Structure formats: C-alpha cells, structure tokens
Structure 1
C-alpha cells in the first residue's frame, strides 16, 4: 500500500557546520598572498600592548597573534553553536582591532588581516549571523574608518616645494589602504548578509546610529576636495544600493523612511550626481591626472579586495612581501614605493573601464530605485534627475557617435547600455513623475533632453541595416570582439551552443544583428524609440512648438 514514497537516509551525515566554518577560517587566504590569513597572523606579534585580554582571549606580549586566534577558535568550537560562535569571534576580533587601532606607537599590520578574517566570519553562513552582531559590527567598522580618518583625506595637489626627498616607503600606506578598503568591503558584506535575512527583521539592524555613521563614512568616501580612492567608491555606492533595495523590499518601509531625514538623501544624491558626471577613458584610467573628472583607480591602491576583483591586483605580491614569513615581528617589512611600475597591455585599462561603466550603471540604478521609493514628490525626486541624467545621456551619445564606433574595445556595448538604461531613468521620470518636473528646470536642459531623444527617433528611418549581408560586414568593423566572445562561449562554455539545430543560431543572427545595430548608433531597439517618442511628441509639456518639432522631423525625413 503506497510503495511510491522516496525513502530516507537512515545514516544522514548532517555535516558539522561549525567544523566547516573552523576550516574555512583556517584556510582563508586573500588573493595574491603567499601565506594564509591565519598563517600571516602566526607571524605577527604586538609589542606595545603588553597584555591583551577581553573575554578569555589572552594575547601575551611577544606571542603570535594567530596563535591566540586559533586558540579562541578551538576553544569556542567545543562550546558554542554556530550563531554564538560567529558573534563571539566578531566581538573578540573587533576588540583586538579596536585597541590595536587606537594606539600611538603600535604598528597596525594585524588590522587588515583581522578585517579580512572578520569578513570571512560574516559571510560564511548568512542565515547564521544574527543581525545584532551585524549591527555592532557595522558600527565598529564605521568608527574604525573614522579612526583611519586621514587615508581618504589626502589633498588634491601638493606644494611646489613638496620635495620628494624622503625614503619613499609604501608599507604603512599599503597597510592603511588595506584597512580602509577591507573596511568598506566589510560594510558592503554586512549589508548584503543583512539583505539575506527574512524581511520582517530589518529593524533589529537599523537605528539612528547606523545611518549617522554611514552618512559620515559616505561623505568620507565619495569625496569632493580630496583625492578619490575608487576602491571605496564602489563599495560606498553599493551600500546605498542595498539600502534602497531593501527599502523597496521590506513591508514596514516607513520605519526606515521615517528614520532617514531629507538631508541624508540630499547629501547622498549630490555626490552621486558628482560621480555620474566623471569621465571614463581607457588611456588615462591608471594615470594620475586632473581631479574629480576622471574615475582613475590609483596605482598605489591596486589590489582586489574582499568581494570583487577590481584591478589586475598589482599590489597582491606586496601583501605577501609585507612580512618576513620566517620571523615573528610587529613593524612591517620594507616595501619600496617606486619599485612598482615596469608597456605590455592596455587590456587592463579596458577591463577597468568595464568596472567603471558598471559603477555608473550602479549609480543610475539606485536613481531608478529611489524613484520607486519616493514615487510621491519629495526634496530629492525633484527634477535634477532631468538635468544630470540628460546631461549624461546626451554626452554619452555624443562621444559615442564621435569617438567610439569602430574602436574595437570590449566596453562599447555596456557604454551603449548606459544610455539605453538612462533613457528609462528619463522616461519613468517623465511619465510617472511629472508633478515635480518644474518648468524652470526643464529649460535648463532643453538642448540636451530634446537632442538625446532625437538621437533615438533618428533610428526610425533605418536605411542602414534592412538585410543580413552587410550587417555582418559592419560587425566585422565594430564588433569583432563579441564574435570572439560568442565563439569562446559556443565552443567551451554554453550547453545550448552545440549541435545548433537551425533555430538557435537564427536567433543568434537576430540578436548579434540588433546588438551591432545598437552599437553602430543607428537602429536602436523599437521600445526605446517609443519611450523617446512619447516624451517629445507627448503633450504633458511643450518642449517644442508644432513648427519647431517638424524642423526636427525634417532632419530625418518625414
């Protein structure tokens, strides 16, 4: 009777999750380093704090620090289950980072590896990390960054008599760059594991102090008057993405919104506007050039970081060469600063452009989110998302048409995705938020709005493509890199791309065609033509009179 059911396993090995977590801590290794993180902390002592102790976490004066970490780990594996083992490790390593940090004489070499270790502790099982531990860890990392106040506050230009006669040493600068970058990466990690918790419990994380501390550190990261560290700009805007994305996806959204003032957003969005108007150019990413106009990714902080692999990791060998690896020490191993740099490839510049274009996609994506949060009018959905976004759309169509077509870079498609995205940031601002699009603000960008819509409606002529034979000749000219990409995807990495049955490559010779149309800046997609049509031609606001509009239509045909 009912011999159908799936039979259980009588000897289920539910794996010991705290043992897996112990092992993932013990063989945690940051990319490019020779030793493991615990095996670097076995080579570190702290010789000014004569006796560290918080809660049976004694470190002696000359003892290895990672000796005490692995003693804590073994001692608290036996005792605590996973959700208590996590926050025990978080508060103990936090207190150690704290009193190594607030000290006048002591070197801070243990701090980057303890922050990376703390990040490995947080993100291991995101369901197991209770969010009061996340709250305390978030507040600790924010005031840890305000301890390292000066790393994100180097001035733009130095003295003319700033003589570079100095030992030119990089090891302390490398340490506090690692501290700041791993700290911002840990803030992103805290908020994305908090994003994974059930959606009724976000108020256990958020209070006044969370948002004040992130307001300080966000004004610190997306700087105006100091040299930008791009590593922290990525993470500092991804935090704002996680914030808007959970304001959209929680039920009691009022408590976050009533907890946030208007000044928080109108200090955030102006720095996002100042970030969206910066330039992304391959030939001078890694250059040091004019300030606050080129997102540029400095040579002196080029490593991966804890989440995403952002440069080519040129400073990853120096993390391993920051310690002597056969010795127990406190001061750093000497890294010369001008030995790095040695000319082979500008492909590195192309992929750093790829990251910076995804950064601008991120910025106008959180614009797209907080249109949807503040669907009703406020201080912040206030018409300057016509000004800055239409300036952006118009210039990234203009120098696309003037500069990028036929330049065999991988980053063209994404760069003509940005415009294709930000039109929609125009469009739902036009259709669904016209009540705040003030008449004085629309005429600040009446040039650029109308011209940017015109460069979409020019594609309805379409005397270019119309067939298949010369379009593939065009994509030999503009889009050979994506032919290499799709052949490498077809021969290695895609399950659908073998034994192609003459219906799956007739979709390829539809979508490569519409891709190379959308790159060649004639024949965009029909839907974006409609969205650009129903802004200019629609009578919600008179952009053009009827005798000024057909002066634009005669410059296509019509």
Structure 2
C-alpha cells in the first residue's frame, strides 16, 4: 500500500545540472561545447579586464576566463546568484568588447548564447532582478555599438566582416531579448511588477524601433526576435493579476508606437517563392544569402549558418578574429525550407494577431488602444488572407494552408469580440471605411451553412487527396510515428481521425468551417449590435446561399 522510500536519494544539484547544461552549451551547428567555443576567443588589444574577478589579457581567451568563472562560481554562488553573476560579468564583457570598436566581437554572440542557456535554465529559479539587468546591459552594449546598431540597407558584396561578427551578435542579442522576456513571462503571475520598469519598457521601445526597421532592410531573424519580445510583454500583461499597474506603466504611446509597426509587419507579405531573396524590400521577408540562421530559440529552418557557427571558432587554431562564416557558401535542395519559412513567418503573423486579439480580450471595455483602427487593420488582415487562401492557397498543397487558416479564424475571433461588445470606440468612419471586410467575413462563414458539401465519406477524403496531400502525409506521419494507440483501434479513434481531417481540409477550402465559426460570423450581421446592412442590403447577401 504505502508509498515507499529510498536509502540513497541521489539528487544531482540544481547547479550541478546547471553546469551540465552550461559547460556543454551548444547551439545548432555550433558543433561544440559552447564553453569551448568561448575558449577559442582571444583578445590582444584588451590586456586588462576585471569586474567580479575576470582576468583577461592579449592571447588570453574569453573562454579561458569563462571556464574560470563557471567553475569557481559554482561553489561560490547559488543557482540564481550564479545566473546573475554570469549575466553581469559576461555582460561587462558584452560591453567592454562592444565599446571596443577596434576589436572584433566574436565574444558577444556565444556569450549571449551562454546568456540564453542561463536564462532558459529555469523560469522559477531565474530571478527577475537578474533578468531586468540582463536586458539593460544588452541595451548598453547596443549603445556602445552605435555604429552598427541597426542594419542600414554596395560595400556589402559577399563579405562577412562585421556581418559574421557584429550582425551575427545582433541576431543572437535579439533572440536573447526574446527568451529573456519569455522567462519573464514564465515567472509566476504574481511578481512581475519589479520587472515592469519604464527603464525596461523604454529601452525595449527603442530596440523595437531599431528592429522593425521600416526605413532600412530589417533582418528577419531580428524581426522575429522583436515581435516575439512584444508577444512576451503582452502575455506578462494578460498574466499580472494587478494588470492595472503594468498597463499604467506601458504608456498608450508605447502601445501605439509598437502596434503601428506591428501593422506595418502584419502587412508585409509572406511569399515562399522569394522568402530567401533580397528583392522587393518592405514586403518580401528577405533573410536570404545576406543573413539566415537560428539565433537562440529560432529553428529558422535549415539553420544554414548553423554549422558555420562552429565554423566561426577555428576549433583547430587560437583565433583573435572570427574564422570566416561564409555568407553565401550557404545552402538548397528543395523549398521545404521556404515552405517551413512560410509557416514560420505565418506563426510570426499569428503572434502579431494573437497579442492583437489578446489586447482585444483584456481591454474589452473602452480603451485608447481598442480604437477601431485596430478594427480597420485587423479586419483588413481577415478578409485579405481569406481572399489569398480561397484564391491562391488552394491547390498549393502546403502545410502553410493550415496556418493561414489559423490566421483568418483567429482574426475572426478578434473582430467578432470587437463587434459583440466593444463598439464604444466605433464610429461610422470605421464602419463604412471597413464594412466590406466585416460583412464578407460574415458571409464567408454564412454560406458554409449548407452542410450538403460533404454529407458523406466518398468526397472530402478525395478532396484532401487533391490539395491537403501535405497535411494528409502528416496525418499519416502521425498514425505512424507521433502517437501511441494507432494500432488495434477501438473503432472511434480512426473515425475521429477521418472526420477531423475531412473537416480540416474543408477548413482549408473556406467551406464547411467549424459551425461555431459559422455562427461567430453570422451573429455580427444578424444580431443587431451593429446592423451593418439595411433591409435593402441584407437580403442582397442572403440570396448568395438561398435565403
């Protein structure tokens, strides 16, 4: 009966497993113990360094001092104080190499990668004070690298001088902001407010202004990092029960100055056939030969520069300057990377409209941020992607069809909650300015009410055989790999598989939508919270399905 015990409960220490992860730090393609990576970073110019005991000299590797710290800092510091000490010391390193334009900064990318293993190591263990300071020190490093702060849009001809140094460290540092604020998100819903400091939020407002660079070609690894940072802020918002305090800190100017460039994002195009192509900028998400790889969470796809991250440190010689990471020695077999990039930028557009629908939830009442300009742009998104899917993303047989479906249905949720309750911002300006989008967002789900489309088992299976072949091969990958009772079934599981897949590819077809969604576009018209259409216009759409 009773639960049993153990003679020799051998628990590895939290900091024990910490040094595990830390010493064997590795980033995809950075083939190494990234601590060793660091061990391949000597800096001649700076022969004097010491913050919390950080001896460094001419042929004295950054990593030699990194291992120095890691080791004796284990017995000195605790879990979170170890974190903080790494953050601040290696941050002083971040700085004094960043403000040392004469040297090259191969340090900061993997230093920041170390910062990430730190950051990730636990949410609860990691402390918001340390996390606070890490972002502030990253902002100081960006100020020290004022020359190479952003990516100004032909001195750049396949030459990875600072492109594989400062710019690579920029992507790394941006992914660091992202994961920093993600572990802040994971910190419990009670103790954010100390993080909520307008120092933090102003510094971020600036870094966002530098990332979503509307006027200079914004590196898409960086774009992803910044939009994810915004998602993390909005999520910690939804979380801190005393959300009034955090919302007081976040200025309405902050809201606007961010969400407007989020509009300029959500309305830059997703075009696989040219994703990795630096052509029509301010629309096609380039991240092509110029610069593509992971960073610190991103599985950007191939991680082309990934193995080059290892190729950044000689891993065969002591290097004062980075080993060349070639910019277009890069990859390319078949655009499944472009397909997954479409899905990736589609999850980026999802994050955008997600925090949009999420602020529409919390700010349900009157809000200077629920202004209905939200209505305009978000409903534009809804109708626009609806059109793209039913017109071009049909037959295209991609996995990204599913994600565009997610986009449209979630912006439907957003504008619908806007419709149902939050007209107190709305006026006839926005009504007629975007009446077409809303009303047809409505009809698109209305006309689905036929239910005579499938009605059976011989047709939608073939429809998916036609277009949904991709996600069909993925449901087969599911039946084969990714779940458990796909063997000797109770005669309900496979049936559920086939109903779900059939309604799924229908949902790719903008037909046979979830009947909840059909109603949740019917009610905006028929429920008179706003009577969009007069009696001389409502029947004009009613005819298009019968009625």
SS of the aligned residue for 1:409 comes to: coil
Asked whether the equivalents of residues 474 and 516 of structure 1 are also in contact (C-alpha less than 8 Å), the reply is yes
Asked whether the equivalents of residues 164 and 324 of structure 2 are also in contact (C-alpha less than 8 Å), the reply is no
SS of the aligned residue for 1:172 comes to: coil
Instruction: Kindly provide the CA deviation profile for residues 472-495 of structure 1, in whole angstroms up to 9, marking residues without a partner as x.
Output: 121211112222111121122211
Asked whether the equivalents of residues 25 and 114 of structure 2 are also in contact (C-alpha less than 8 Å), the reply is yes
Say if 1:238 and 1:319 are closer, same or farther in 2 by CA, change over 3 A: same
Determine the C-alpha separation between the residues in 1 that align with 2:369 and 2:155. 48
Asked whether the equivalents of residues 148 and 180 of structure 1 are also in contact (C-alpha less than 8 Å), the reply is no
Determine the C-alpha separation between the residues in 1 that align with 2:298 and 2:156. 34
Task: Using the TM superposition, name which of 385-394 and 331-340 deviates more.
Answer: 331-340
Asked whether the equivalents of residues 143 and 213 of structure 1 are also in contact (C-alpha less than 8 Å), the reply is no
Instruction: Kindly provide the CA deviation profile for residues 449-475 of structure 1, in whole angstroms up to 9, marking residues without a partner as x.
Output: 222222211111344222111221212
Aligned-residue offset at 1:337: 4.0
Aligned-residue offset at 1:150: 5.1
Asked whether the equivalents of residues 435 and 532 of structure 2 are also in contact (C-alpha less than 8 Å), the reply is yes
Aligned-residue offset at 1:336: 4.8
Instruction: Kindly provide the CA deviation profile for residues 153-208 of structure 1, in whole angstroms up to 9, marking residues without a partner as x.
Output: 4444xxxxxxx588742142112222111111111222222223333321222212
Aligned-residue offset at 1:102: 0.3
Asked whether the equivalents of residues 29 and 306 of structure 2 are also in contact (C-alpha less than 8 Å), the reply is yes
Say if 1:538 and 1:138 are closer, same or farther in 2 by CA, change over 3 A: same
Asked whether the equivalents of residues 106 and 169 of structure 2 are also in contact (C-alpha less than 8 Å), the reply is no
Determine the C-alpha separation between the residues in 2 that align with 1:419 and 1:377. 25
Task: Using the TM superposition, name which of 429-438 and 52-61 deviates more.
Answer: 52-61
Say if 1:149 and 1:499 are closer, same or farther in 2 by CA, change over 3 A: farther
Asked whether the equivalents of residues 172 and 332 of structure 1 are also in contact (C-alpha less than 8 Å), the reply is no
Instruction: Kindly provide the CA deviation profile for residues 285-308 of structure 1, in whole angstroms up to 9, marking residues without a partner as x.
Output: 111121222233332221111112
Aligned residue among 196, 199, 204 for 1:206: 196
Say if 1:552 and 1:286 are closer, same or farther in 2 by CA, change over 3 A: same
Say if 1:533 and 1:272 are closer, same or farther in 2 by CA, change over 3 A: same
Residue 72, structure 1, aligned to residue 62, structure 2? no
Asked whether the equivalents of residues 244 and 373 of structure 1 are also in contact (C-alpha less than 8 Å), the reply is no
Task: Using the TM superposition, name which of 401-410 and 359-368 deviates more.
Answer: 401-410
Determine the C-alpha separation between the residues in 1 that align with 2:156 and 2:273. 30
Aligned-residue offset at 1:554: 1.2
Asked whether the equivalents of residues 42 and 61 of structure 2 are also in contact (C-alpha less than 8 Å), the reply is yes
Aligned-residue offset at 1:93: 0.6
Say if 1:54 and 1:452 are closer, same or farther in 2 by CA, change over 3 A: same
Determine the C-alpha separation between the residues in 2 that align with 1:17 and 1:33. 25
Say if 1:473 and 1:7 are closer, same or farther in 2 by CA, change over 3 A: closer
Aligned-residue offset at 1:516: 1.8
SS of the aligned residue for 1:539 comes to: coil
Determine the C-alpha separation between the residues in 2 that align with 1:5 and 1:431. 55
Asked whether the equivalents of residues 462 and 522 of structure 1 are also in contact (C-alpha less than 8 Å), the reply is no
Return 5+ residue gaps in structure 2 as ranges.
Answer: none
Instruction: Kindly provide the CA deviation profile for residues 314-367 of structure 1, in whole angstroms up to 9, marking residues without a partner as x.
Output: 1123222223333222122345544335x6202111010011111111111101
Question: Size of the alignment, in residue pairs?
Answer: 547
What corresponds to 2:521 in structure 1?
532
Asked whether the equivalents of residues 384 and 441 of structure 1 are also in contact (C-alpha less than 8 Å), the reply is yes
Say if 1:351 and 1:336 are closer, same or farther in 2 by CA, change over 3 A: closer
Determine the C-alpha separation between the residues in 2 that align with 1:423 and 1:518. 14
Task: Using the TM superposition, name which of 55-64 and 361-370 deviates more.
Answer: 55-64
Aligned residue among 79, 83, 108 for 1:82: 79
Aligned-residue offset at 1:441: 1.1
Say if 1:165 and 1:155 are closer, same or farther in 2 by CA, change over 3 A: closer
Instruction: Trace 1:95-106 onto structure 2 (pairs within 5 A).
Output: 95-106=92-103
Asked whether the equivalents of residues 248 and 372 of structure 1 are also in contact (C-alpha less than 8 Å), the reply is no
Cα RMSD, aligned residues only: 1.9
Say if 1:103 and 1:90 are closer, same or farther in 2 by CA, change over 3 A: same
Asked whether the equivalents of residues 24 and 35 of structure 2 are also in contact (C-alpha less than 8 Å), the reply is yes
Moved over 6 A (4+): none
What corresponds to 2:235 in structure 1?
245
Return 5+ residue gaps in structure 1 as ranges.
Answer: 157-163
Say if 1:495 and 1:282 are closer, same or farther in 2 by CA, change over 3 A: same
Determine the C-alpha separation between the residues in 2 that align with 1:168 and 1:482. 38
SS of the aligned residue for 2:48 comes to: coil
Instruction: Kindly provide the CA deviation profile for residues 514-533 of structure 1, in whole angstroms up to 9, marking residues without a partner as x.
Output: 11211122221111111111
What corresponds to 1:519 in structure 2?
508
